[model samples]
Target: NNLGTELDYDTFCFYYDWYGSEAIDGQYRHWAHAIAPDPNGGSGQNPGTIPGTQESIASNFYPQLGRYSSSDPNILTKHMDMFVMARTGVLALTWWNEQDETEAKRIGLILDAADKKKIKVCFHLEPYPSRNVQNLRENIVKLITRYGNHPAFYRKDGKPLFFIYDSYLIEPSEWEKLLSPGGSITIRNTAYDALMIGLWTSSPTVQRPFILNAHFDGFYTYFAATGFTYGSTPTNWVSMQKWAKENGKIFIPSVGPGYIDTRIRPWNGSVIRTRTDGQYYDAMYRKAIEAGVSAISITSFNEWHEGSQIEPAVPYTSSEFTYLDYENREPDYYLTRTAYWVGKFRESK
Candidate 1:
């Protein structure tokens, strides 16, 4: 997916690699997601949750490489290549649990692969099961120590960055204990200190207060679904960034082509943000660019489960139902398309 443009670390794309296949894991991991026909969900077939059914996979669109293992070196190589194509400088890798050795090894492989392409890998830390105010520092030190020596480990200002998804789940008081300087569990001025970017899921009304108290370095809107929240909406980004400047906070606006998660969340069957032949992505890119943000974050590069992926997709039909396609476009349509916008972004900068 190389756009052939010079890499810019200011740009980042969220990358998902939790996919599994029989070739590596003896069976599918995420792809075998049993799906209940959402009545309104686009299953042309009968009712009942189906497991291991090809069409029943948890994505509205089929991947170019069908049911491949994330640990496969070939797939990893291809993904790093695509990031070059898109001119996406950083891969915001999703990390769920700190103690899961399986995930740790998987990410180690990813870091090694990304190094070859001169691409950087930053941790996208989710709210793990064992997370708490006190142990969060332990998790940070363990993660950075585990991978810091690698050239691919992403860093800025001589320190690593951590994107905290849904950070509001833990109260601001709890985060102050960890993020605020001089607090009981603070990691400031230590090797464990990082540029902690919390998820901003609401308007400035609530965000300014929460973010100020939490003491995060910056914030980003992770959801690609526009209008889903005040923070995710593009129109709000201009004001948000302006406020960020005045408040001395870094605000990164996350953009995407569209979203359709009916396969994974049947309850959202009716919610569909049509890609409209790349117009949605184009508009979102323009909005973010117009906001004058020095940095940008993509909602995804290959999160197929949510259909927000900008990775190449294709048309295919199965016995159950037809997976959505890019309307007869070439397989690399999204990649090439994204490259042009990335071009515009740099030009504006």
Candidate 2:
């Protein structure tokens, strides 16, 4: 039975970086840009405000770390602990490229910490400038050779698992050359071969061919807000899953608590979705399970910039912005909620 398989119940969450105290550099990179100060005390971001609003960034809640560093051991430990408590099997870490020494070091620390707790870590490959087939090949090789044997590195069927974000940026022919079985630089039958899942958007015309032509093993949609696009919409997941299953491909649907990136894209608040306490997350989880997806992904664990983070967020007030709090709920409300959903999913299966 599908319910008896261990892989059918796996869940993963996307993790990001923002606060960097003395780790990357002294300055706060993303957090600094995520909020604006106010003379009257309290901070706010222009989410759903004026068109092309150009002010400091804003978030719904402030972190307990207050612009801390990702390299901090304490933060990493706490993060891993939260994942354990949430019953999440893997952490899809955001990675740029091989040249980012700071990120690499941070990843190393994460690997060690996660290994101790038996939490898996997978790479979420970002689209960097001048990225191409050959460069991607080299990067994948580097990643496998360096970290493949690590206990924390996520592997399926004896191969490392990789998720390519914005994979459509490259042409199908180019990706085929790298991913197809009989291409010029095919990775399909090579030692570098791994489960490569590409980003699939709402457009089937654009997504279906990309996966088939590129020879990708599977596809996923990272967006959390349902109804934003056909791909993100929960109603469309069953069809997508059926299509993928018929083609012997994987369909890993993503769910999230809510979405609100107005702080970063001031002109783009039209897609904002409310969390509605925990109902939104519960609905997303329910749909993913109903779609009978083998594996499901959480839109984010700590993507604070987009207000999709499930990580603990404390109430805070600054000069200009007054962020939203859990309101009688503890900071770990989302984490605990995740655990409850995971249990529900398991029982339903």
- Candidate No. with top TM-score: 1
Q: Give the lowest summed-lDDT range of ten residues in model 2.
A: 47-56
Q: Could you list the CA RMSD of all candidates, in the order they appear?
A: 3.5, 5.7
Candidate 2's TM-score reads 0.88
lDDT of candidate model 1 versus the reference = 0.84
- Candidate 1 lDDT, 56-77, residue by residue in tens: 6768898888887888888999
- The runs of at least 3 residues in candidate 1 whose Cα sits more than 4 Å from the true structure, single-residue gaps closed, are 1-4, 36-50
Candidate 1, position 311, lDDT? 85
lDDT of 2 by residue, 1-349 (tens): 4532232226879988545654456655566563333335445633233111112234656676566577888889988888887888789988888487777788899899888778898989999889899999999999898998888889877877888998989999999998888889988878899888898885787788778999989988899988877778998899999999998898888899888876555556777888888788899989988998888889899787788889888887656566766666788888888888787677755
The local distance difference test score of model 2 is: 0.79
Using alpha carbons, what is the TM-score of model 1?
Answer: 0.93
Candidate 2: C-alpha RMSD after superposition? 5.7
Instruction: Please name the candidate that would achieve the greatest lDDT relative to the true structure.
Output: 1
lDDT of 2 at 79: 88
Q: Where does candidate 2 stray beyond 4 Å? A: 1-9, 22-24, 34-58
